[PDB]
From a paper:
Here, we describe the crystal structures of the N-terminal RD and the C-terminal ED of the lantibiotic resistance-associated RR NsrR from S. agalactiae. NsrR is part of the nisin resistance operon. The expression of the genes of this operon is induced by a TCS consisting of the HK NsrK and the RR NsrR. NsrR belongs to the OmpR/PhoB family of RRs.
The structure of the NsrR-RD was determined at a resolution of 1.8 Å. The asymmetric unit contains two copies of NsrR-RD. NsrR-RD structurally adopts a αβ doubly-wound fold previously observed in OmpR/PhoB type regulators. Five β-strands (β1-β5) are arranged in a parallel fashion constituting the central core of the structure, which is surrounded by two α-helices (α1 and α5) on one and three helices (α2, α3, α4) on the other side. Superimposition of the structures revealed that helix α4 is slightly rotated outward in NsrR-RD. Furthermore, helix α4 in NsrR is shorter than in other RRs. The putative phosphorylation site of NsrR is Asp55, which is localized at the end of strand β3 and lies within an acidic environment composed of the side chains of Glu12 and Asp13 (highlighted in pink). However, the structure of NsrR-RD did not contain any divalent ion. Instead, a water molecule is present, which interacts with Glu12 of the acidic pocket, Lys104, and another water molecule in the vicinity.
Residue numbers in the entry:
A (entry chain A), B (entry chain B): 4 to 120
Write the structure that this text describes.
């Protein structure tokens, strides 16, 4: 009965890192097929999505707006240190929060805790 | 046809129409291999890029940010009339203007003339 987190990320290092860390406290799944994310989300029923918006061949901006037609669950963006994002931007893009790479797991933990309640 | 325009677009109908319309005034190229877009842009050396930011599996904002590490040329985003794209977003993501599908060719022509001036 742990909270379910779905991770949209193509970097297997990052995915492994997050699965290792978060699995103690959450049911964590990552994308299997990037062309099937709507079905994967319908089937998995996550409580929260971690959405990397820096993936070259998965348009995180497009897909967040598409998912927002259907979902009210929190979406936390994973952004780049390079990129300069803020909460106004995150909200206008359909997100609830953001965290920039490279990030501390401690900061991610605090954000996950606060948001999931 | 001296000005060079590169179009990042996977709708082949839009590419065909734009190539045909712009042929009179511009040297126009589009994507040959979506795995090699950055390299094609480096090879073609456009004066302007039309970057569709609605492609589900090519992250237009990511690639604009990558291109902005070494190009200062104008980039006009192609968006969708029902999405949340506005000028604040266009400029914040490294673009210089945007045009929303479906769009007027007269508006595109005016935008191209103005920003290539």
């Amino acid at each position: 009965e742990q909270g379910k987190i779905y991770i949209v990320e193509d970097d297997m290092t990052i995915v492994s890192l997050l699965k290792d860390h978060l699995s103690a406290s959450y049911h964590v799944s990552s994308v299997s097929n990037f062309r099937d994310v709507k079905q994967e989300i319908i089937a998995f029923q996550p409580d929260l999505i971690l959405m990397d918006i820096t993936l070259p061949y998965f348009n995180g901006f497009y897909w967040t707006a598409e998912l927002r037609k259907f979902l009210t669950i929190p979406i936390i963006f994973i952004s780049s240190s390079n990129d300069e994002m803020d909460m106004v931007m995150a909200l206008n893009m359909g997100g609830d929060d953001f965290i920039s790479k490279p990030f501390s797991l401690a900061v991610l933990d605090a954000k996950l805790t606060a948001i999931l309640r």
